[PDB]
Every structure is written in C-alpha cells, then in structure tokens.
Amino acid sequence: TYESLYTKYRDDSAILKTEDYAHWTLPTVYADPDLREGKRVNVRRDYQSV
C-alpha cells in the first residue's frame, strides 16, 4: 500500500506555488507526467525570455 504513503507525504502548497517560478523561466522542466499518455499537450510561454 505504498500509494497511501506516497499520497500522505506530499505537500500540495509547495507544488502549487512552484508553478509560477517554472512558468517564468522554463515551463517544460516542470510538466506534470500524469496528464499525458504519450501525446503532446500544449505548454504556454511568457511574454519575456530573460
């Protein structure tokens, strides 16, 4: 029942907050693997590339 431990030890606040940081620099490094099954799902970019 390692799924129970895996779900227990997560921290949703950090995971939700760390989305903006990736979105400002490099979105493709932080993509969720559970929303895809072998096909492209689009990732949006920002107005600046610094």
Partner 1 sequence: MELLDAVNTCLTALGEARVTSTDTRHPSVALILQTLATKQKLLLERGWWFNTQDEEMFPDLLGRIPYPAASISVESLDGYNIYSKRNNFLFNNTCNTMYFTGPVCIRVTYNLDFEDLPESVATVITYRAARAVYVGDLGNDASVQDLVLNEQQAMLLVEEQHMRNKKHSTRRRRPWGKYQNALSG
Number of H helices, E strands in the chain: 2, 0
How far apart are the C-alpha atoms of 3 and 16, rounded to whole Å?
20
Of the pair 4, 33, the CB lying nearest partner 1 is at 33
Residue 42 is a binding residue for partner 1 (CB under 8 A):
yes
Told to check if 45 binds partner 1 by CB under 8 A, we report yes
Instruction: Report d(CA 47, CA 23) in Å as an integer.
Output: 11
Choose which of 20, 32, 34, 37 interacts with partner 1 (CB under 8 A).
20
36 sits near partner 1 (criterion: CB under 8 A): no
* Structure-block tokens of residue 12: 């949703």
Which positions touch partner 1 (CB under 8 A)? Answer: 17, 20, 42-45, 47
